[PDB]
Amino acid sequence: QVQLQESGPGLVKPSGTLSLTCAVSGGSISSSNWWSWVRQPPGKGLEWIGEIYHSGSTNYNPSLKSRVTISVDKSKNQFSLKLSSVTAADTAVYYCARDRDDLSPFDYWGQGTLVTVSSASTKGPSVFPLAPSSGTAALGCLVKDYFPEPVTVSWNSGALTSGVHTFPAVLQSSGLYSLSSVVTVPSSSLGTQTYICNVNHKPSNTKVDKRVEP
Amino acid sequence: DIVMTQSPSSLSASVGDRVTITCRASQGIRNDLGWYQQKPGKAPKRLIYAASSLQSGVPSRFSGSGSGTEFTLTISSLQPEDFATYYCLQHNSYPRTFGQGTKVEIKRTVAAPSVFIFPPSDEQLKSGTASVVCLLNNFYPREAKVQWKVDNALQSGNSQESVTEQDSKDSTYSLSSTLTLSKADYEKHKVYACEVTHQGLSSPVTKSFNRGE
Amino acid sequence: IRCIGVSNRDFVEGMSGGTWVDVVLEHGGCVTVMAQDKPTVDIELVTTTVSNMAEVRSYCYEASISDMASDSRCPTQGEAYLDKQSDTQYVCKRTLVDRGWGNGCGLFGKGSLVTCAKFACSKKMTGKSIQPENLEYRIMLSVHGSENRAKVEITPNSPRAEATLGGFGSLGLDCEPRTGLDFSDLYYLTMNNKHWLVHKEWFHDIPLPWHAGADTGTPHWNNKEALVEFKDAHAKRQTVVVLGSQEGAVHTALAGALEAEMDGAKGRLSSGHLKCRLKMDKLRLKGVSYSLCTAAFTFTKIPAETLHGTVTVEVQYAGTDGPCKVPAQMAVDMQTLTPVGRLITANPVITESTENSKMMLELDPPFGDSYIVIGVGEKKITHHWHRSGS
Amino acid sequence: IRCIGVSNRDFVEGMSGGTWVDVVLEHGGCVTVMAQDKPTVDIELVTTTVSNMAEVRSYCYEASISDMASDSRCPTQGEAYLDKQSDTQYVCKRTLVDRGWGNGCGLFGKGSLVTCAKFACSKKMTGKSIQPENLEYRIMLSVHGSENRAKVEITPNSPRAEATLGGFGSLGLDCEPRTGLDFSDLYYLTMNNKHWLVHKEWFHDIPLPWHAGADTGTPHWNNKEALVEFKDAHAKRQTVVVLGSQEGAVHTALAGALEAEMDGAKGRLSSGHLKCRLKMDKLRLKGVSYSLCTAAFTFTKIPAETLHGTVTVEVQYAGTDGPCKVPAQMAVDMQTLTPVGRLITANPVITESTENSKMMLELDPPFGDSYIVIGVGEKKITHHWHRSGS
């Protein structure tokens, strides 16, 4: 049926304004459906932000109704969220969602985009190889010193999907995130197979393909 | 505003077990309650709708019951793919409100880690920092002890750990430990070791290297 | 050959060698017309049909509600208010409720309370208009036995039609489509693939939420309250709950209404009635007094009695001298062979020049004993027949 | 302090220094008991509840059908038959239909016709039994003003309960759970999360398809015909169509039945009635004729009139000589200060030894003008009050 994708800056100045857009495909946004914004601070639970019908009619969470505005653009088939006067309490993963037509709760969700609230600026990552060294072998990539989160990392343009572990990023004293992505392969294949990791950091618009060799 | 309280907060159960998650509402919601499954990294997916109604594309081992103020999500036969964190949502009264969520983990036969170790790359050394990486692959349970040893000097306060989320097929966890040193202090030493203690190990496993080899 | 099995069968006799005869055509019924020196004919009203029907009004009969909000005011503190009160996606209700120190007010009396809830219609029924421009009666004509069959279309805007019948010439129809059934006090209601003709006032009086016409985007539902009951008003809130689906209720309320069906986009009715004038001057027996059939017939079936006392027979003919005039009569005395009773299938004819052709005859026996006689001379067939009247 | 805002409030006066007083406890109502040399008390029937209810019978009110098959027989050729005729997943109907040469039979008469169709229930309602072993009345007791509040559980199998009230001692309850409401002629019916108490015979007479108890695998539906109508019998087939959902119909048929609600697995009723005997020998004013409060009070609110003519006041006290006996009365003449009217909240007491504590009093003013007086001597408070009776 329908697919939802969020987009917006992943970084917002304290007291600044968060702006996000949800692009709907596969179906019109003018169907008999309510469209919601939901959010989730990392490692915490879900909080319903707000709601709009294609007539423009809105319903906002009272805890934050004074700061949200939600709107619709039938022209581009999407809808938007403005959240003003942000604090660190607005740091969260944001989802756009749809209700079904029997008013039933969220029947479709977007991928979710992380938005951080910080006076720090964004920094692109550096990628380093984690080479294998003379049954099964292990290797990886070190994605170091970036901000804000996240980074995504695939292998061989997505074609190595198995035995892969991308660890959650840790925060360092530098206030920069570091992360490692890892994979186990046959040892026998080490010399007879090219292994590249594709590191993606959207706030910095960074894209790095790194070859991991013995 | 109606408060939704889930119990328990977290829960460890073996494959095949019967798992019961409870949800309570501060006011009457009738049966306008939904259950959602949130796998890590992904958006939550609707499991159930009007307190009872099993949704399409969802195995029949999930079931919902209750009304008024007391509700229950039962998963009849636990599965590895059921490792997740489950939410209840009331939509009887504006504003709709979620429960704190209930994390469901899995118990399995215990398995030992595959330990690996990675020296700094010369490429990274070029920029004045050295990251040594120890890796513990596919083990259970979560508890593990990684100690760093530079020339047999027990290291502390200069490393960081990270753990993967529970695998949804083999129910395992994986761990990364990163020792960070200034390039200078990295050259000042020669033997870099990583010692791993796990209940699945009959004795600590040490993986190590000597600089430039 | 048609009409024989039909329960609702009329028999209309002509007049002299007269031009016209009047008939009443009902649905699922048949009229057998007989005139002297005329081939017997069968008229049947097969299908009444209505195309291009315009949606007059829709009624919601199943809905759901969620996300209710309430506003309450203390005594002497005004009228309660919500933004959604005038929002067309919501259904609301104002009421009064007891207030005092116990629930936030500084004085003991009635307070204003409004409750609104999102409203969504699950299922609806639709009433469409019926204009005589799209009404169309289908009539089938079949010679009594044997392009000996025609189908004509009588409309209120063309109640006159002519139908040719091969070597029998042609028949003419002048019908009164006005006195058929009154469709200016009727709507075509559809509800979950069930279809009725209902009366306009009754349809307008239906106390369900409604909208006119089915426009795009979002239908604006009037009278949403009709599917939603408010209960148990507390100081700060009020419980809202949908009634059930009112489908079965409507169906019950339609127990004795004209039932219709759908076909593509076109409605098909079965409450048939049609006055008609049959013009029969251009109708003719195949105009040749043929030679009588010389060879011998045989019964392919034992002669059977129709619901109306008449008798159907079917014979196989062994001659190649076709086309030839079938010798068929009934007789009590097998010596004088005095013709008794008559033939519904008047002046039967073998038209095929190949042997072993089949022919059906419908005879109208007298009461008591009699003999069905078919053939000439020695090889002629006889069959004993009793008609006990009832 | 409770009961003040309650519309259904009774006032029961004690007798001498007598042991007992009889009360009638209704749902959403409250009883204020006053006895001389007793602290005034409040009794409230809060919730009637029923757990562990047993499914007696379920009725299907929405179904669907598909995959119909028919068998027809010629006249004199027996009874029509299908395998699925006795298959519990099917609903059938036998009838007669006109047959003749036109549709395969060699003789004109009634033929046997059976039509079966797969049957599936979409939605059902369930009637459960109510046994007094799982019935449970929840009663709340609250001292009139101030562990001064208790909640007790009266069951038909334990109609006697005692409740302690801190320094006020204890009260005793002997209720008649029999004369409460009759549940031997009642079922707990649930239908799409709506709940009623209905009469047994009415429930049994409900003409919908039914099964007893909700056993596993496949429920066997009796009387499927009730949700399915057969129409327009042709020679070889017959059209089957479901009625609508009979949900709204049932809801309409339940317009005036006792409405209940659900909570977890436990039913919660609101048709409360309970005769009770209040034992008050062990009940006591905090047994100390305290010193009168010396410091000065102030009104935290303007005194308000309850629905019952009485007046609630709330005062803040500025002394630390607590616990102390509150000086409170009403007077017409401010010279003699003759006590008029009375106190619902009898012998009020400041129990907190910290200044700026709050206290609610409920007074019962005389008609016409009067003065609410609270305090001692110079700093005592007065407040003008008129009681126009109605």
Q: Give chain D positions within 8 Å (CB) of B66.
A: 264-265
CA C161 to chain centre: 21
Contacts of A112 (CB under 8 A, 6+ apart): A6, A40, A93, A94, A95, B42, B43
Asked if residues D110 and D150 have their Cβ atoms less than 8 Å apart, the reply is no
B45 close to A (CB below 8 A): yes
| B contact chains, 3+ CB pairs < 8 A | A, C, D
| CATH number assigned to the domain comprising residue C216 | 3.30.67.10
Q: Which tokens in the block code for residue A67?
A: 């700061």
Asked if residues C24 and C45 have their Cβ atoms less than 8 Å apart, the reply is no
Q: What is the dihedral of CA A32, C120, C254, C230, to 10 degrees?
A: -170
Asked if residues C74 and C111 have their Cβ atoms less than 8 Å apart, the reply is yes
Q: Is C337 left (phi over 0), alpha (psi -120 to 50) or beta?
A: left
Cα D149 from Cα D170, distance rounded (Å)? 11
Answer yes or no: do B82 and B175 share one domain.
no
Answer yes or no: do C296 and C342 share one domain.
yes
Helical (H) or strand (E) element with C51: none
- Exposed/middle/buried for A12, CB within 10 Å: 0-12, 13-18, 19+? buried
- How close B91 gets to chain C, by Cα (Å)? 5
Catalogue the long-range contacts made by C176-183 (C-beta closer than 8 Å, 24 or more residues apart): C176/C274, C176/C275, C176/C276, C177/C132, C177/C135, C177/C137, C177/C274, C179/C273, C179/C275, C180/C137, C180/C272, C180/C273, C180/C274, C180/C275, C181/C48, C181/C269, C181/C271, C181/C272, C181/C273, C183/C130, C183/C131, C183/C132, C183/C135
Asked if residues B47 and B38 have their Cβ atoms less than 8 Å apart, the reply is no
Q: What is the DSSP letter of B186?
A: H
Enumerate the H helices of chain C as residue ranges.
Answer: 200-205, 247-253
Amino acid at C201: E
Q: Which tokens in the block code for residue D264?
A: 């977890």
Q: Residue with structure tokens 């946004």?
A: A29
Residues in chain B: 213
- How close A4 gets to chain C, by Cα (Å)? 20
Cα B172 from Cα D58, distance rounded (Å)? 47
Answer yes or no: do D174 and D272 share one domain.
yes
- Exposed/middle/buried for B115, CB within 10 Å: 0-12, 13-18, 19+? buried
Q: What is the DSSP letter of A123?
A: B
Residue D221's closest CA among D213, D231, D230? D213
Residue of B nearest to D268 (CA): B68
Asked if residues D323 and D290 have their Cβ atoms less than 8 Å apart, the reply is yes
Query: Within a 10 A sphere around the Cβ of D383, how many other Cβ atoms?
Result: 15
Answer yes or no: do C105 and C227 share one domain.
yes
Q: Which tokens in the block code for residue C57?
A: 């009004």
Across-strand partners of B136?
B115, B175
Cα A151 from Cα B142, distance rounded (Å)? 25
Domain boundaries, chain A: 1-119, 120-212
Cα D303 from Cα D188, distance rounded (Å)? 46
Q: Beta strand pairing status for A11-12 and A113-117?
A: parallel
Answer yes or no: do D279 and D369 share one domain.
no
Cα A69 from Cα A64, distance rounded (Å)? 10
Q: Beta strand pairing status for D41-50 and B159-163?
A: unpaired
Across-strand partners of C48?
C137, C269
Cα A13 from Cα A176, distance rounded (Å)? 17
Q: Is the dihedral of CA C217, C223, C227, C233 positive or negative?
A: positive
Query: Within a 10 A sphere around the Cβ of D39, how many other Cβ atoms?
Result: 27
- How close B90 gets to chain C, by Cα (Å)? 9
Answer yes or no: do B99 and B150 share one domain.
no
Q: Is C78 left (phi over 0), alpha (psi -120 to 50) or beta?
A: left
| CATH number assigned to the domain comprising residue D74 | 3.30.387.10
Cα C137 from Cα C44, distance rounded (Å)? 11
Asked whether the beta carbons of residue B174 and residue A182 sit closer than 8 angstroms, the reply is yes
Cα A81 from Cα A76, distance rounded (Å)? 15
Residues in chain A: 214
Q: Give chain B positions within 8 Å (CB) of A168.
A: 162-165
B26 close to D (CB below 8 A): no
Helical (H) or strand (E) element with A59: strand A58-60
Q: Is the dihedral of CA D376, D381, D386, D390 positive or negative?
A: negative
Cα B176 from Cα B146, distance rounded (Å)? 9
Catalogue the long-range contacts made by B44-47 (C-beta closer than 8 Å, 24 or more residues apart): B44/A46, B44/A106, B44/A109, B44/B87, B45/A109, B46/A105, B46/A106, B46/A107, B47/B73, B47/B86
Answer yes or no: do D168 and D31 share one domain.
yes
Asked whether the beta carbons of residue C67 and residue B91 sit closer than 8 angstroms, the reply is yes
Tell me the C-alpha to C-alpha distance, in Å, between residue D43 and each of A199, D163, D283, D313.
71, 11, 14, 21
Answer yes or no: do D300 and D385 share one domain.
yes
Asked whether the beta carbons of residue D248 and residue C243 sit closer than 8 angstroms, the reply is yes
Q: Find the CB nearest B43 among A95, A131, A168.
A: A95
Answer yes or no: do C172 and C42 share one domain.
yes
Cα B164 from Cα A140, distance rounded (Å)? 15
Asked if residues C161 and C170 have their Cβ atoms less than 8 Å apart, the reply is no
Q: Is B183 helix (H, G, I), strand (E, B) or coil?
A: helix
Structure method: X-ray
Which residue range forms the structural domain that includes residue D157?
A: 1-51+131-182+258-285
Which of D263, D266, D268 to probe the B interface (max B CBs under 10 A)? Answer: D263
Answer yes or no: do B98 and B181 share one domain.
no
Three-state helix/strand/coil letters over B126-149: CCCEEEEEEEEEEEECCCCEEEEE
Contacts of D76 (CB under 8 A, 6+ apart): D107, D109
Asked if residues B44 and B103 have their Cβ atoms less than 8 Å apart, the reply is no
Cα C27 from Cα C4, distance rounded (Å)? 16
Residue C356's closest CA among C320, C313, C302, C304? C320
Resolution to one decimal, Å: 2.8
Q: What is the DSSP letter of B199?
A: T
Answer yes or no: do D177 and D265 share one domain.
yes
B142 close to C (CB below 8 A): no
Answer yes or no: do C87 and C165 share one domain.
no
Answer yes or no: do D386 and D310 share one domain.
yes
Tell me the C-alpha to C-alpha distance, in Å, between residue C307 and each of B169, C145, D73.
75, 18, 18
Residue B54's closest CA among B66, B46, B45? B46
B67 close to D (CB below 8 A): yes
Q: What is the DSSP letter of A161?
A: -
* Residue numbers after which chain C breaks, C to N beyond 2.5 angstroms: 146
Residue D194's closest CA among B205, B50, C79, B170? B50
Q: Is the dihedral of CA D50, D52, D54, D58 positive or negative?
A: positive
Q: What is the DSSP letter of D257?
A: S
Asked if residues D40 and D346 have their Cβ atoms less than 8 Å apart, the reply is yes
Q: Give chain A positions within 8 Å (CB) of C66.
A: 103-104
Give the residue from B108, B128, B163 where a domain finishes: B108
Topology of domain A120-212, per CATH?
Immunoglobulin-like (2.60.40)
Count structural domains, chain B.
Answer: 2
Answer yes or no: do D41 and D101 share one domain.
no
Across-strand partners of C375?
none
| CATH number assigned to the domain comprising residue D385 | 2.60.40.350
DSSP code per residue over C212-223: SS--SS----B-
Which of C245, C261, C301 to probe the D interface (max D CBs under 10 A)? Answer: C245
Answer yes or no: do B122 and B191 share one domain.
yes
Which of A33, A36, A57 to probe the C interface (max C CBs under 10 A)? Answer: A57
Cα D345 from Cα D146, distance rounded (Å)? 9
Asked whether the beta carbons of residue D193 and residue B69 sit closer than 8 angstroms, the reply is no
Phi/psi of residue B100, nearest 5 degrees:
-60, -20
B69 close to C (CB below 8 A): no
Q: Find the CB nearest C5 among D103, D191, D302.
A: D103
DSSP code per residue over D272-319: -EEEEEEE-SSB-S-S--PPBP-S-EEESS--EE-TTS-EEEEEEE--
Q: Is the peptide bond before C303 cis (omega within 30 degrees of 0)?
A: no
Amino acid at C103: N
Q: What is the b/e burial string over C329-353, where b = at least 16 CB atoms within 10 angstroms of the residue's CB? A: bbbeeeeeeeeebebbbbbbbbeee
Query: Within a 10 A sphere around the Cβ of C244, how many other Cβ atoms?
Result: 27
Answer yes or no: do D317 and D359 share one domain.
yes
* Angle formed at CA B158 by CA B155 and CA B160, multiple of 5 degrees: 110
Cα D366 from Cα D339, distance rounded (Å)? 10
Q: Give chain C positions within 8 Å (CB) of A74.
A: none
Cα D187 from Cα D247, distance rounded (Å)? 18
Which residue range forms the structural domain that includes residue B56?
A: 1-108
Asked whether the beta carbons of residue A103 and residue C122 sit closer than 8 angstroms, the reply is no
Q: Is the peptide bond before C365 cis (omega within 30 degrees of 0)?
A: no
Q: What is the largest CA-CA distance in chain A?
A: 65
Residue C294's closest CA among C327, C263, C262? C327
Q: Is C357 helix (H, G, I), strand (E, B) or coil?
A: strand
Which of D3, D229, D246, D308 to probe the C interface (max C CBs under 10 A)? Answer: D246
Q: Which tokens in the block code for residue D99?
A: 């047959």
Residue C135's closest CA among C193, C52, C28? C52
CA B80 to chain centre: 13
| CATH number assigned to the domain comprising residue B196 | 2.60.40.10
B30 close to C (CB below 8 A): yes
Q: Is D378 helix (H, G, I), strand (E, B) or coil?
A: helix
Q: Find the CB nearest A45 among B98, B114, B135.
A: B98
- Exposed/middle/buried for C13, CB within 10 Å: 0-12, 13-18, 19+? exposed
Q: Give chain B positions within 8 Å (CB) of D262.
A: 67-68
Cα C217 from Cα A193, distance rounded (Å)? 56
Q: What is the DSSP letter of D169?
A: B
Q: Give chain B positions within 8 Å (CB) of C69.
A: 93-94
Contacts of C140 (CB under 8 A, 6+ apart): C2, C42, C43, C44, C46, C149, C150, C151
Count structural domains, chain C.
Answer: 4
Across-strand partners of C129?
C54
Answer yes or no: do B5 and B96 share one domain.
yes
Which of D122, D247, D254 to probe the C interface (max C CBs under 10 A)? Answer: D247
Q: Give chain D positions within 8 Å (CB) of C191.
A: 244
Cα C302 from Cα C284, distance rounded (Å)? 31
Asked if residues D67 and D92 have their Cβ atoms less than 8 Å apart, the reply is no
Asked if residues D178 and D298 have their Cβ atoms less than 8 Å apart, the reply is no
DSSP code per residue over D324-360: EE--EEEES-TTT--B-SEESS-S-EE---SSSEEEE
Cα D293 from Cα C250, distance rounded (Å)? 72
B23 close to D (CB below 8 A): no
Across-strand partners of C317?
C297, C357
| CATH number assigned to the domain comprising residue D10 | 2.60.98.10
Q: What is the b/e burial string over D192-211, where b = at least 16 CB atoms within 10 angstroms of the residue's CB? A: bbbbbbbeeeebeebebbbb
CA D274 to chain centre: 12
Residue B132's closest CA among B194, B204, B196? B194
Cα C134 from Cα B47, distance rounded (Å)? 50
Cα D158 from Cα B114, distance rounded (Å)? 65
Cα D197 from Cα B162, distance rounded (Å)? 58
Asked whether the beta carbons of residue B70 and residue D261 sit closer than 8 angstroms, the reply is no
Across-strand partners of D215?
none
Cα A88 from Cα B72, distance rounded (Å)? 34
Cα C77 from Cα C103, distance rounded (Å)? 14
A in contact with D (at least 3 C-beta pairs within 8 A): no
Residue C287's closest CA among C98, C39, C21, C15? C39
Phi/psi of residue C103, nearest 5 degrees:
-130, 40
Cα B107 from Cα D73, distance rounded (Å)? 65
Q: Which tokens in the block code for residue A109?
A: 């969700």
Q: Is C144 helix (H, G, I), strand (E, B) or coil?
A: coil
Residue of B nearest to D265 (CA): B66
Q: Is C251 helix (H, G, I), strand (E, B) or coil?
A: helix
